[PDB]
Amino acid sequence: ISSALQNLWTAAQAAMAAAVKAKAAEIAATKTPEEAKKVAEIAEKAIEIGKLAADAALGIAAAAGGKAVIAKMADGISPEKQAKYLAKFDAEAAAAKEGLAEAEKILKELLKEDPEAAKALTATALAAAAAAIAALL
């Protein structure tokens, strides 16, 4: 049902987090335990960045697809309903861009905490997110 789709998305997010944590273990192995704890916290925030970016990309793509669907159902539907659903979809895209802004907010502080670990963990998170987004679509 929608059950299995949510199970798929849950498992994809779990794979993303597992990739980020594997990279985090690689980084922490060359650090003191006291700095490795910091690496772990940066890894958690990078996992969050990856989830946000994936959700935002999916929302933007769904909104664009819906607006294209309305642009074919041209005079098949009244201009009033056209505007109704084009707006609903613009709000959908706006929420996705809000998620992107929050991801940027987190990335800027992670760069203010440890730029090299932030860069590596966020690159791993975004790559796992791209792989999941492509696998779903």
Residue numbers in the entry: 5 to 141
Give the published text.
Pathogenic E. coli and Shigella spp. produce the outer membrane transporter ChuA, which binds host hemoglobin and extracts its heme cofactor, before importing heme into the cell. Heme extraction by ChuA is a dynamic process, with the transporter capable of rapidly extracting heme from hemoglobin in the absence of an external energy source, without forming a stable ChuA-hemoglobin complex. TBDTs consist of a 22-stranded transmembrane β-barrel with a pore occluded by a globular plug domain, which is transiently displaced during import. Using an AlphaFold2 model of ChuA as a target, we utilised RFdiffusion and ProteinMPNN to design binders targeting extracellular loops 7 and 8 of ChuA, which our model indicated were responsible for hemoglobin binding.
We expressed and purified four binders with the most prominent inhibition zones (A10, C8, G7 and H3). All binders inhibited αβHb and Mb-dependent growth of E. coliΔTBDT:ChuOP when spotted on agar, to a concentration of 250-500 nM for αβHb and 125-250 nM for Mb. To resolve how closely their computational design matches reality, we attempted to determine the crystal structures of A10, C8, G7 and H3 in isolation. Diffracting crystals were only obtained for binder C8, and the structure was solved at 2.46 Å. The crystal contained eight molecules per asymmetric unit, which have a pairwise similar RMSD of ~0.6 Å. This was comparable to the computational design of C8, which also had an RMSD of ~0.6 Å to the C8 molecules in the crystal structure, indicating that the predicted model closely matches the X-ray structure, once flexibility of the protein and experimental error are accounted for.
